[PDB]
């Protein structure tokens, strides 16, 4: 093939993907923006060169961000997403029929609009009266505002700007908070690989261990991250539920079928390996300021 | 960074690795064979451009390969690789203190030779008094004598290739060729291709289906091995149950493996053959059977 | 820099160029049709997978492709392209103020029609009264008519890739057909393939030899295109003189080429036909001979 | 093909050569050095990751910078090279029969050694008692002897440490008073392409027409090198010989054939092309100090 995407996913790994076009370009004062049409995966946005979401598995990573936090709450009626600017975290969110209002609070307008524009499987998730979009730091944002939410999402950057998002201290005294009674937060929380699980993943679960009674890391493989991609739920509450009780919330909750996730396959999401399960375990390294 | 290994995963998606050295070569006229020292990966051994076996990783695939079947069989004293050249698929089955013999035949000498050569984690593997080495086409072999086997292995390319190793991965070679060589509760294993939410369409689902037509009990179970750039697979087959728990895996891997497993722990294989919602759906509807 | 236009030279040697966008497409079932915007060499025109044409330095190609033959020429009226359906030949040519016809005659009416669209140099060109599309073969086409022209231009893919094209190379072509379709003093002047030090040898040596069987006088040139990342090779052939100074050369362009020629001047087309060393040597002992 | 090697020629342009190995590898204090085996060019001597030279093409490169300086000159004796690590400069110079001294003067010792150690080609050049290597910075040498020369080479990396060897005031108040009567110099120019020429070429060229009364440049392509390379004559006296008087120089003087240079190649070498012969004279930029 003549023409390729190339993106270096460490020092000494690089991807490329075949490309037909390069569909539109953008910028902000923050970052370069460009949305690809890739031969593997479909229409691909990338900023400052590397890929945020591709067309053919962004599903999986917004089911797997959402649905598992959601399902675990009895009730949950709002929810603030730190990050989230592509519309899906939101997308996903607003099939839960007990919703009545997403905060998405990001700090690049001019992304949030590209996407607006230009990401078509968000375009109804953007015109819905329940989401309100947030231009400011999530920090600041959480801070100024004495709304409680019941679910909380950080759909950010690996842990920089975004660093201070992660750490103990934002957890205890910003974050919680803002968490009503029976509460739930999810991250995701970066690569959850065999072996580059111990960059971030394992440093933010045991960051939340810290901070919350009940923690739950869950990780499922995204072919356009090049990896196995992690996620972590905190709360004060158990997060507890069978595969047959997912299933019959997922029926009775969310709209339309999902793609990617059953009951079952949360289990098996939650169920790491032997070499990550016992790296989890040892993790000393707690994110702080 | 100047110097990199590249592999087309797919025609439209390629892996770079940084390369240390070019270490050694052979060739047969089945193929090319290359052993490199990559950085992020180790020392990787590449079949016709395909890298095979990464020193990081190679243990995730082989204990993935080899545990389930023989945890899942009472007491396995004898074993059959098909392929397995490598040497690696031998090493784990003779971590097993109750195997008595295990077979690897390959139909490739001079892989097995570089690899007895270079592959030093397997030295030990290979010198061991129960291993026999047989270089032949192993539908050949199997039919040729009448011994029969505790666990057969298949570790073979996958059928998508369409050489030599497609005829071992139809429903008469597995009917009336391997069925017929396996002992009372004898358990089949193959390594069953790309096993990602998409790429699982091309050969697992059909390999599943396939052995869903010859054996009563069929668990297809998978797990992420990073050098491959992809979530792997591979289906257990036999005529006697295949439902142990976690903790009775881990109680047998306890009493009969020496050290102890890399990868591999009850939970581990639990979750390895709990298929997520779209693969398990592809898994059921697939109506694919290998045939020649 | 993230995206690439990437190009096999030879299978050992790849050469990457920086993009800023994919343009335009098509495709026929000749193949397929790609205009890029690329960072070194601006617009970039590329028929399956191979560049064509480059905004920054295509001058260079057509020019020394088309202006040596018209002043070798005492009064180039008419031409015959084979091939040429970028309208680039054509746009040199019509520069002649001699000329009155240009016919290009070029297999790939989808090369044609969008290349008159996309590429606006050319524009002009075609739409030149002067200038007779024609949708054939060139053998055929010329073998069809009477007609004779004072100089044939062959623009057309190397002889290497064997398809369609491989015939209007071979001795029997150039001395059945087209030798009888040039006028007095005719000239051919055909495009070479690569010229290089080594690279010659694949088809610009046996392109010259192969002229040498048919035409009295056989001048063999050559010229660097960056964008190509080789020397480039064209030859002329006539049965009268091919022997000017470089400044009877500058003298014939003042007189009859409007414009000044970015590339080409007298003295660049006396160094362009003399060779080194070693391309000399191995054009003078070069015994292939193209036939069907 | 499995296995490349990949440089970046300029900021947008990339070159990549299929591996056989990689043979050898050495460092300096200054620089990182490796002989590749590579597919399209043989062996291949890369220094901090550019390519300095391949086994397939160099003697194109080696004839061209010394044989015409050599030939131009009435009967050349001794001759200093300014750089030259690799040993091919003085392997050509030293098949010329009037040559009793060639001094090869470079600033990093383990290059030498590792080509006088691995660059096959060079092993009788190093043995031949005529040539003395010096590990020194090339203008600190010329100005500390007294020795004047009858050709002096510049063979050092494009004009950083070299640029000094480049400019106006080292040609006319160092090198100039070591060369002898007669005397002529010839430097390396760097890529001498249609429009690559413009970076350097141009002004070494200008900058030598400033200083020397003939100046005459002259280029050829070097495959390994992607580019037409340029190289530069200067002197007091006229730099004038036909192809047929070089010709029969070349087989009184040199010894053994040359592969790649004859006197008509020459005189094709020194004709430049329209818009190369016209930049070269609207030069304006002199080098300076
Ligand atoms: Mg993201
Ligand atoms: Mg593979
Ligand atoms: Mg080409
Ligand atoms: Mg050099």
Same mark, same amino acid.
């Given at each position: 093939?003549?023409?390729?995407?190339?993106?270096?996913?460490?020092?000494?790994?690089?991807? /490329?993907? %075949?490309?037909?076009?390069?569909?539109?370009? @953008?910028?902000?004062?923050?970052? =370069?923006?460009?949305?690809?049409?890739? +031969?593997?995966? !479909?229409?691909?946005?990338?900023?400052? @060169?590397?890929?945020?979401?591709?067309?053919?598995?962004?599903?999986?990573?917004?089911? /797997?961000?959402?649905?598992?936090?959601?399902?675990?709450?009895?009730?949950?009626?709002?929810?603030?997403?730190?990050?989230?600017?592509? !519309?899906?975290?939101?997308?996903?969110?607003?099939?839960?029929?007990?919703?009545? +209002?997403?905060?998405?609070? =990001?700090?690049?307008?001019?992304?949030?609009?590209?996407?607006?524009? *230009?990401?078509?499987?968000?375009?109804?998730?953007?015109? =819905?009266?329940?989401?309100?979009?947030?231009?400011?730091?999530?920090?600041?944002?959480?801070?100024?505002?004495?709304?409680? *939410?019941?679910?909380?999402?950080?759909?950010?950057?690996?842990? @920089?700007?975004?660093? +201070?998002?992660?750490?103990?201290?934002? *957890?205890?005294?910003?974050? +919680?908070?803002?968490?009503?009674?029976?509460?739930?937060?999810?991250?995701?929380? @970066?690569? %959850?690989?065999?072996?580059?699980?111990?960059?971030?993943?394992? /440093?933010?679960?045991?960051?939340? &261990?810290?901070?919350?009674?009940?923690?739950?890391?869950?990780?499922?493989?995204?072919?356009? *991250?090049?990896?196995?991609?992690?996620?972590?739920? %905190?709360?004060? #509450?158990?997060?507890?539920?069978?595969?047959?009780?997912?299933?019959? &919330?997922?029926?009775?909750?969310?709209?339309?079928?999902?793609?990617?996730?059953?009951?079952?396959?949360?289990?098996?999401?939650?169920?790491? #390996?032997?070499?990550?399960?016992? #790296?989890?375990?040892?993790?000393?390294?707690?994110?702080?300021?």
């Amino acid at each position: 093939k003549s023409c390729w995407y190339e993106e270096e996913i460490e020092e000494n790994l690089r991807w /490329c993907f %075949a490309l037909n076009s390069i569909l539109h370009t @953008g910028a902000s004062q923050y970052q =370069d923006i460009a949305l690809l049409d890739t +031969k593997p995966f !479909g229409k691909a946005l990338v900023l400052d @060169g590397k890929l945020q979401s591709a067309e053919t598995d962004e599903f999986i990573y917004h089911e /797997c961000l959402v649905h598992p936090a959601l399902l675990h709450h009895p009730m949950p009626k709002n929810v603030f997403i730190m990050g989230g600017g592509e !519309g899906s975290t939101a997308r996903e969110l607003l099939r839960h029929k007990t919703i009545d +209002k997403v905060v998405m609070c =990001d700090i690049d307008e001019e992304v949030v609009e590209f996407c607006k524009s *230009y990401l078509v499987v968000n375009k109804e998730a953007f015109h =819905d009266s329940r989401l309100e979009v947030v231009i400011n730091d999530a920090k600041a944002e959480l801070e100024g505002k004495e709304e409680k *939410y019941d679910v909380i999402v950080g759909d950010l950057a690996d842990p @920089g700007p975004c660093y +201070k998002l992660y750490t103990k201290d934002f *957890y205890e005294l910003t974050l +919680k908070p803002k968490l009503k009674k029976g509460g739930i937060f999810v991250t995701q929380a @970066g690569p %959850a690989g065999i072996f580059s699980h111990t960059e971030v993943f394992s /440093c933010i679960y045991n960051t939340l &261990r810290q901070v919350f009674k009940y923690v739950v890391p869950y990780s499922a493989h995204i072919p356009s *991250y090049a990896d196995i991609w992690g996620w972590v739920l %905190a709360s004060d #509450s158990p997060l507890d539920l069978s595969a047959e009780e997912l299933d019959i &919330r997922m029926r009775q909750r969310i709209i339309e079928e999902n793609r990617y996730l059953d009951g079952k396959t949360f289990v098996s999401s939650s169920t790491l #390996s032997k070499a990550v399960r016992n #790296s989890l375990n040892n993790e000393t390294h707690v994110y702080t300021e």
